């Protein structure tokens, strides 16, 4: 409804100055409604930060030959979005870049584990399901490959996004997810 | 002196509130310095930084002990991540870097410093890419400028990740097991090679 057209004002707002520089008044501005209007949908400005990180994990989810193999293909449809999507690239920029760990930003970074652990709980499904359809192996260390995915694949997007977008992103992502797909197959760092 | 005093007062005050919230007047009322003996030491904010980067750098570079060369790459990566847990100094440092340094207008003025730095690295990297590949540890058609890219997201992947987990899992046993992927990678794997 309405929520949507006052959350892209949010979104836009936390990513022309960051969050915590950012008021719920000004947000309020941005899709030109009252202060006390967008209180009836959002409390504060976690609320919105809150819906705005629902949003993108419901995009995700829905844009999905085995089942193992499909998962690459999300992995790979996910890194293109974030290039050609616009919310998406603004979402994960702010909340890559723009969300430091400070005390006015408490409250905020509280709301992010939360989701980015939901995705923890998600990986380990999927890995659970490889091994058990002979994908991957009988052996895997789980606890030990989650590290290795958020570690190669939100360090692959920290880089591009600390870095100005200095290289040609959909190029590299799918080398780095094949590599890291031939790792998770095959290397025995990873077995327990 | 007071030079070193003002250093890790930055330091702490950075940690504890995050870059751009912090005047070089408050690292000074935390130094026992006056904005004058500050001033004196240093212009502004961004080169108190650009003094903190080096001195980690400084750290960094004067820690080289023996073999091989490549074989050397892994003990400085083991040394660094190591470092990151027991050395109270590198520790709040990247903790700044990689988290309390928003990428705003504010913090736009030490951001150049951060990439000066981290550009350094990079050509630090692919220095020691080359010499691998001249001492014949890794592949001639070793792709060197994807290898760069590479290095980095990984291992400032897990250091980020580490960072932002709240510390949730244990670097110690996590990160010779992700650098001995990396390393095995660079040497081994195909998509790293150009044509
Ligand atoms: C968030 C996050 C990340 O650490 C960076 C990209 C994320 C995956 C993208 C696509 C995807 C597909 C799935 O079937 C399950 C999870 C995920 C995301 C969560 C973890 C990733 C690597
Ligand atoms: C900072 C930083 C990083 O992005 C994470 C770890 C860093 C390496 C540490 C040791 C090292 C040794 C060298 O001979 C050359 C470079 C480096 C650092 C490069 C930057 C890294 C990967």
Known sequence: KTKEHLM????????????????????????????????????????????????????????????????????????????????????????????????????????????QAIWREKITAVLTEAVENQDLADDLDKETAVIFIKSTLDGLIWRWFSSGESFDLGKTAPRIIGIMMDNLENHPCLRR
């Open 8 to 115: 892209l004002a949010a979104l836009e707002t936390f990513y022309r100055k960051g969050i915590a520089r950012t008021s719920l008044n000004e947000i309020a501005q941005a899709a030109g409604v009252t202060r006390g209007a967008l209180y009836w949908h959002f409390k504060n400005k976690e609320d919105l930060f809150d819906a705005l990180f629902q949003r993108i994990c419901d995009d995700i989810e829905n844009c999905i030959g085995g089942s193992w193999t499909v998962f690459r293909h999300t992995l790979l449809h996910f890194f293109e979005r974030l290039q050609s999507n616009d919310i998406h690239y603004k979402f994960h920029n702010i909340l890559f870049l723009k969300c430091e760990h400070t005390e006015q930003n408490a409250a905020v970074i509280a709301i992010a584990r939360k989701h």
